[PDB]
Amino acid sequence: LTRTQPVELVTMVMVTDPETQRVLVEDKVNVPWKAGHSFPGGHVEVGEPCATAAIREVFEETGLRLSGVTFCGTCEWFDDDRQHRKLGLLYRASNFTGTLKASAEGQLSWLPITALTRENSAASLPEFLQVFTGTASTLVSDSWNGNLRIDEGHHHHHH
Amino acid sequence: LTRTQPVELVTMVMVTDPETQRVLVEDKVNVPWKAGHSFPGGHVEVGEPCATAAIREVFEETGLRLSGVTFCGTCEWFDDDRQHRKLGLLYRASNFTGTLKASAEGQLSWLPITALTRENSAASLPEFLQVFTGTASTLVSDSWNGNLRIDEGHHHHHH
């Protein structure tokens, strides 16, 4: 406390095409246990700002050049010991230049949000959507891969 | 990378009284070099979610009981080595119960936002306001106490 603690910083971005209102999602082939739509995102480097990391990830993975990003909210995951956490910063953006990398034809797809379901998407994508669309802004999971619920101040404050 | 890094997590909350539209600020006496309006906030404990920490801080310092908080954005500060960072999560809230602690009469004040100036407030408060009011959502400073500027992806990515 009152200085640093271990945090795994990750970003996630929902890019919207202002001309069609569709959003950009990773739509790649994979083994049955990993297949599913997912939003671009990755790890924030040490020394690297979070929003900068988000813009870089989108560029490196999709080729799109975001002029900036707008913050939507956070998702937090804790292990059993809770000595560390994964902090995901979710951003949205609709202002960009460039086009999808030819290197990712059948790897990236523009889809209406309504096309995304819990069944055809990566774990917790519906929850991420709640954050991206603005219905929620602070979700937390008590397991590194558990269910994300709204954070409203409930905790073992007396410990 | 690709797991944890040292991050000093801090929260800051702008509470608005829906009946007057005024915001709650710390308005305490202090030496000349520390005096100035400031928004409540503090350090996030290990194991403790960020939004939960924000709600706790407001309760412990003001007595107000927030039913929840809405994310506004982030402020990041880096030292010269950039090996660590201070990540500030800014929230806003207008739904609460309780009243100001008698323990903080001339310590807390409800003031219209227009009453806050760079001259009568703590360092970077104008920038925090930009985030709280929604004009910006991702600010970064290249010094532990420097000027907060909008994060739009500029960095030494080639290093």
Q: How far is B96 from chain A (nearest CA, A)?
A: 12
Instruction: Report CA-CA distances (Å) from A134 to A13, A78, A127, A128, B151.
Output: 13, 23, 11, 10, 21
Query: Looking at the domain assignment, is residue B64 inside a domain?
Result: yes
DSSP string across B39-64: ----BPPTTS-HHHHHHHHHHHHH--
Residue B54 domain boundaries:
7-150
A2 part of a folded domain: no
Decide if B139 contacts B131 (C-beta within 8 A).
yes
Strands (E), A1-154: 5-15, 23-26, 65-66, 70-78, 85-93, 96-97, 108-111, 138-141, 149-150
CB atoms within 10 A of CB A120: 12
Question: Contacts of residue B6 in chain A, CB cutoff 8 Å?
Answer: 4-7
In a domain, residue B115? The reply is: yes
Closest residue of chain A to B152, computed from CA coordinates: A68
Does residue B156 lie in a domain region?
A: no
Q: Which residue has the tokens 């420097």?
A: B146
Residue of A nearest to B92 (CA): A137
**Amino acid identity of A30?**
N
* B1 found inside a domain: no
Q: Residue A144 maps to which CATH number?
A: 3.90.79.10
Quick check: is B128 in a domain?
A: yes
Residue B2 resides in a domain? no
Q: What was the elucidation method?
A: X-ray
* Domains in chain B, number: 1
Distance, CA of A100 to CA of B29 (rounded, Å): 56
Q: Is residue B158 part of a domain?
A: no
Annotated resolution, angstroms: 2.0
How many C-beta atoms lie closer than 10 Å to residue B32's C-beta? Answer: 6
